[PDB]
Design a protein around this ligand. Structure first.
Ligand SMILES: CC(C)=CCC/C(C)=C/CC/C(C)=C/CC/C(C)=C/CC/C(C)=C/CC/C(C)=C/CC/C(C)=C/CC/C(C)=C\COP(=O)(O)OP(=O)(O)O
Length: 159
């Protein structure tokens, strides 16, 4: 499987002179994938949500708090695949369970895969609604302040 230092998971939000992008500095992931048997593959990711870095300590503290991630109550977010559907041209629709702030949803993410030497790379973007996971509640429900749509971007490098 993977390499954190070589890999990146980020989230892009809007409001609306944006992107505002933050990156999770601590996560793990496991991938098992052979394009000759793609549907037999699997992947999981576990993110340490308190490691989310927007490049600003006050923003980082706010987003860790109860109305946002509530990182003390829910320290991790997870994705676990259940199916992989080839989409043609090194693209695969990867379906699985995304759990954020203790709320689970089935999601399908388009992933592009490349191999070069002993390295495999997995790139994709998953749009979600933060409200679906109750991320940014209370006064932060107002989507004229922070948009509901958040794009989760990942670049996973294995071996
Ligand atoms: C074929 C194969 C095997 C492929 C591999 C498959 C594979 C590994 C796929 C991976 C797919 C996925 C889903 C990967 C990600 C996995 C996980 C667990 C993702 C969860 C990440 C996560 C916690 C996402 C939630 C992100 C959210 C909703 C973040 C909130 C966004 C945020 C913090 C916005 C804050 C806005 C900011 C910084 C400031 C606002 O400032 P403000 O005060 O309002 O300014 P003003 O007042 O001026 O307006």
């Amino acid at each position: 499987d993977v390499d954190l230092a070589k890999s990146k998971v980020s989230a892009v939000s809007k409001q609306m002179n944006v992107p505002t992008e933050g990156a999770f500095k601590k996560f793990s992931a496991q991938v098992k994938f052979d394009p000759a048997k793609a549907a037999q593959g699997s992947a999981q990711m576990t993110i340490d949500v308190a490691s989310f870095d927007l490049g600003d300590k006050m923003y980082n503290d706010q987003v860790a708090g109860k109305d946002w991630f509530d990182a003390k109550t829910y320290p991790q977010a997870t994705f676990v695949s259940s199916a992989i559907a080839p989409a043609g041209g090194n693209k695969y629709n990867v379906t699985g369970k995304l759990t954020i702030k203790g709320k689970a949803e089935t999601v399908t993410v388009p992933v592009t895969v490349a191999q070069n030497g002993a390295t495999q790379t997995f790139d994709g973007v998953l749009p979600i609604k933060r409200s679906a996971f109750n991320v940014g509640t209370g006064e932060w429900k107002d989507t004229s302040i922070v948009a509901d749509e958040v794009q989760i971007k990942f670049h996973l490098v294995a071996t």
